[PDB]
Amino acid sequence: YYKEIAHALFSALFALSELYIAVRY
Amino acid sequence: YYKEIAHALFSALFALSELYIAVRY
C-alpha cells in the first residue's frame, strides 16, 4: 500500500519541478 | 515555449491525481 504512495509522491514532486522549470525558463 | 508548459502542466495534474487515488484508496 505504501509502495504506491511513494512512486506517486515522487512522480508528483518531479512533475511539479519540470513545470517550475517550464515557467521560469 | 508554450508547448513545454502544456505537457508539464498536464503531467503535474495527472501525477497529483494518482497521488490522490493512492491516498484515499
Side-chain angles (χ1 to χ4, degrees), chain B residues 1 4-5 8 10 12 15 20 24:
Chain B
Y1 165 64
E4 285 74 54
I5 316 300
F10 294 117
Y20 180 86
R24 186 154 56 97

Side-chain angles (χ1 to χ4, degrees), chain A residues 5-17, chain B residues 11-12 14-16 18:
Chain A
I5 316 300
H7 187 24
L9 192 58
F10 294 117
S11 179
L13 290 177
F14 166 83
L16 294 157
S17 298
Chain B
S11 179
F14 166 83
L16 294 157
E18 185 185 12

